[PDB]
Ligand binder design. Structure first.
Ligand SMILES: Cc1ncc(COP(=O)(O)O)c(CN[C@@H](CC(=O)O)CC(C)C)c1O
Ligand SMILES: Cc1ncc(COP(=O)(O)O)c(CN[C@@H](CC(=O)O)CC(C)C)c1O
Lengths: 432, 429
């Protein structure tokens, strides 16, 4: 729990950050005049104020006060390609040559859809959206319409987009689906909820690893329970792979040998352009065939926009192939293991959790299995870790998450590991 | 009618023989997407056209045929297919850097332009679509008021999770929505007496867009403004289409202020875009530094392509004066189309405002979803096919949305093809 001594250390770190970044401070005051709190994406705000970036290339960026950083945040997994990938750039140039806002289908949509279907083993048919939020809403829409049922089982700490935020329990802004929340990884508790609610369950919605909720892998016995009970009760199992799809050529489902009924996608698949998708079993997705009587409707001005169709096909087929996915996850597993070794050898009360190229620091010794474990870990030390990494020229999420891009190399990874050893040394007093 | 059914059979068959390369694309696209489709409004029988490329106001399909594009991406495509200023904005965004994972100055600059333009928007937040913008406005209203009921209108279209174009759709997000009749003062007053106490929001377009370019009458919008203030509901004007009609949208033209306003389409320069904005006191509930702040993340909300191209769109291309000029040009165009119908005693009209218009095969008043549905639907489909044969592309449902790239030759060609339709189909009219 919170102490005066940690608060004082945070106050000094905030004061140093403020004195070092006066141009960012002034941008925040101006931004407040047009956006609430100077903000249009809540996760970008942190106190005293966020850094404003001027420019970036490759894995690196520079803030408006002239400091340089390596970007380990990687746009919360969407920024797989760095800030200036030449193949992405060529795809943008091609989109512009085809033409913008053509108001009709192009072949580019079909080619992107075929790449997504080749790549993901339980997606027979796919439709594109403009966000992961839209992909998850459309999957819930599919489930409730098909089953005629209202109840949705999801999990505390689960994050499925702007209208489906359960990171801190029920949010008053959520779309008013009838959502029952379970505890992540809790076999017996979840089995009890499915016995009470199963018969009116339209859908079970779950990430195979909590992303925003702390990079907490799902355990097999938990995912097996969900898969078996969804089938038994006649609910659609929806795996939200908006973050986890990168973890192998075919995402977590290939790693697991477990198939969901629908799968949602987002982040890097559109080449860093706006993007989401929902897809799954043929018989479910065919309900969207507009030639069919009583077809479900799914419009959306930018669903098939040329920039996303072109960059996305390039991302999946020319850059982040299935082999590149295996190699990046192996690189990430080695990185994460090295960071935990540094913690263990120094007897530090911290660990990094995650899979492949995704991980999050948690200031705890306990196994990290559910949202409760994440919230019980020390939140002050997590904020102090954020400001420390900044001083060392390493940018990662305020909540302690990194997501390795393809542009991170040896020098970047070595600097992160060094910075961590330094944090442990310099903050030993607060780590008892 | 049997005679009209045969004319449609013949036109569908002729379209099919004209476009065998698009036919083969459709067979292949069915393999990976449901019905070969990722945006339902693009499908039409016997199959949709596939386009290969376009420049300015013109495109070419995969069979080689050229068209003037009068659809203009359902109002988003205001800049044509290759605007040099949009292109420069994309090049500047690439120079700044993609996926920078942080704020840049560009987002504040875009937001300043949006708040400057729209007279009831004190503060704004960006989304990735109009659908997201409307869902967040509903989230704001229900979360602030603590109430569940939303009044919307039959014919109304607010996005993929809020589609009332044919009444309640089974796929809509399960807000407790009550549907009135558009422009119906009596019936709508009644619904507000019954539901006012539990009403979080009144959600309404100042002109039905997808529902058929049907302008809202002043008495109807006055009713909604007065009742919303009386019962404590948030009035939400969905200006995703109508924002273009003046520099400050429909609200500037009307002198009526909604509590929240949703935006989309052309404002992000053609890039993915939506926004919700309004009264300062409502929007501050999203200040992330405030006590019990509402959360609104979204990976692409502040994306550099949208922020740069949208800033350019509002400040360099579609200025307040450009907006007045296009809407005037659009009013004169639509008047000419109606004069042609009138002079040829044709049983059709075009409804709309400024640069937006839709054909309806009826001479009755078009004031609600009922009136649009009652007009001849078979003649509407024949008209689409006929315009294609003349090298004019507009929506299957008979809507146009003039871009800045439409010029004298295109408008003249549209008008002559309308006159040709009336003469060639005289027997069915
Ligand atoms: C598992 C999962 N499922 C859905 C979403 C929503 O995707 P969009 O942000 O594209 O709407 C997300 C989005 N995650 C991030 C969105 C942002 O960076 O603004 C935010 C979270 C770290 C809270 C996700 O992680
Ligand atoms: C008044 C209004 N309000 C909200 C929306 C939703 O915008 P997004 O399609 O960008 O989500 C729309 C979008 N309508 C368009 C969607 C598309 O082109 O696929 C076209 C409609 C005729 C169905 C709108 O017209």
């Amino acid at each position: 729990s919170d102490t005066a001594e940690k608060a004082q250390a945070i106050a000094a770190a905030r004061n140093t950050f403020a004195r070092d970044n006066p141009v960012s401070a002034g941008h925040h005051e101006r931004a407040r005049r047009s956006m609430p709190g100077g903000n249009t994406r809540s996760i970008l705000f942190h106190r005293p104020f966020p850094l404003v970036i001027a420019q970036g290339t490759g894995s690196r960026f520079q803030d408006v006060d002239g400091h340089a950083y390596v970007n380990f945040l990687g746009e919360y997994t969407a920024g797989l390609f760095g800030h200036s990938h030449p193949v992405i750039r060529a795809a943008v140039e091609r989109a512009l040559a085809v033409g913008l806002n053509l108001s009709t289908q192009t072949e580019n949509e079909a080619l992107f859809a075929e790449a997504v279907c080749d790549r993901f083993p339980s997606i027979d048919l796919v439709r594109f959206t403009n966000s992961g939020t839209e992909a998850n809403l459309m999957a819930l829409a599919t489930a409730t319409a098909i089953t005629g049922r209202k109840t949705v089982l999801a999990f505390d700490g689960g994050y499925h987009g702007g209208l489906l935020n359960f990171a801190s329990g029920h949010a008053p802004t959520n779309a008013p689906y009838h959502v029952v929340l379970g505890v992540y990884n809790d076999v017996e508790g979840t089995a009890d909820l499915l016995k009470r609610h199963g018969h009116d369950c339209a859908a079970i919605l779950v990430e195979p690893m909590l992303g925003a909720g702390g990079c907490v892998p799902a355990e097999r016995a938990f995912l097996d329970l969900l898969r078996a009970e969804a089938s038994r009760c006649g609910a659609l199992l929806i795996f939200d792979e908006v973050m986890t799809s990168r973890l192998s050529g075919g995402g977590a489902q290939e790693m697991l040998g477990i198939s969901a009924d629908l799968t949602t996608l987002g982040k890097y698949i559109g080449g860093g352009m706006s993007f989401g998708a929902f897809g799954g079993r043929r018989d479910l997705m065919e309900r969207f065939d507009p030639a069919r009587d009583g077809a479900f409707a799914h419009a959306g001005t930018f669903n098939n926009n040329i920039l996303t169709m072109s960059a996305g096909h390039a991302a999946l087929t020319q850059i982040y192939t299935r082999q590149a996915a295996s190699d990046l996850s192996a690189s990430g597993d080695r990185f994460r293991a090295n960071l935990n070794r540094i913690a263990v050898e120094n007897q530090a009360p911290l660990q990094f959790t995650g899979l492949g190229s995704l991980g999050t620091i948690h200031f705890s010794r306990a196994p990290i299995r559910s949202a409760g474990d994440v919230r019980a870990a020390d939140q002050q030390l997590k904020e102090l870790f954020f400001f420390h990494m900044l001083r060392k020229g390493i940018y990662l999420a305020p909540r302690g998450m990194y997501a390795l891009s393809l542009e991170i190399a040896d020098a970047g990874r070595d600097a992160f590991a060094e910075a961590l050893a330094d944090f442990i040394g310099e903050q030993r007093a607060l780590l008892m």
